[PDB]
């Protein structure tokens, strides 16, 4: 998963 997608999902 790209960084922004991963951060969006987590937060």
């Amino acid at each position, epitope marked *: 998963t790209g*960084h922004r997608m991963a*951060w969006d999902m*987590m937060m």
Partner: antibody
Amino acid sequence: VQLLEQSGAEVKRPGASVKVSCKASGYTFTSYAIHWVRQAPGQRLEWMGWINPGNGNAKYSQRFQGRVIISRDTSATTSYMELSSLTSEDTAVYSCARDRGFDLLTGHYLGLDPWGQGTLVTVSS
Amino acid sequence: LTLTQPASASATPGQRVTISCSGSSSNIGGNTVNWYQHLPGAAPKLLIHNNDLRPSGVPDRFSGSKSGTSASLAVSGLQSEDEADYFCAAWDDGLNGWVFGGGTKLTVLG
């Protein structure tokens, strides 16, 4: 000023478990992810995992999955990293860092900042 | 995984020095590079985020660039206080987590 303050140095025997703490202040604790990383003597930093302190959702590196638990206490604005089944390979400085995340207006990534001072864990028989 | 940096870099005061970080399509290729200064006994200090942006407080003599799967930190008008370890960091799409360079010890010659 934002601070992440970590628990003190620990000495553990092989097969034991260690729990390191990271006390946050100076910002809204539940609004930013916390990451845990470690660095063994002579080696590079290695990422272990992260947690959304708002809901407790934690995710881990496949290298540690199954023996690390990252958690938080929101009333104490503290995150914890527990690592089980210790061996001498686990001797390292364990550090937390705050994810400033992405700027919602610009899309820029803002960085992992600040970082805790680290907690040395020594595993020895 | 791994980002690759030279073990050391050095220059005289006033000179410009560059430190490189090499990675792969799944980290530096697709995500931003972020650089930290590490001084003895102190937590890492963010110097550059999002490839080339300086946080508040960071002197304008520090700059960053990224191109393809590589990136560079440049320090111009080198001062003795700049002697430190510098390391790069980027999200890795395969790890779904952060990867870090091994660090470069910058010596200010003299």
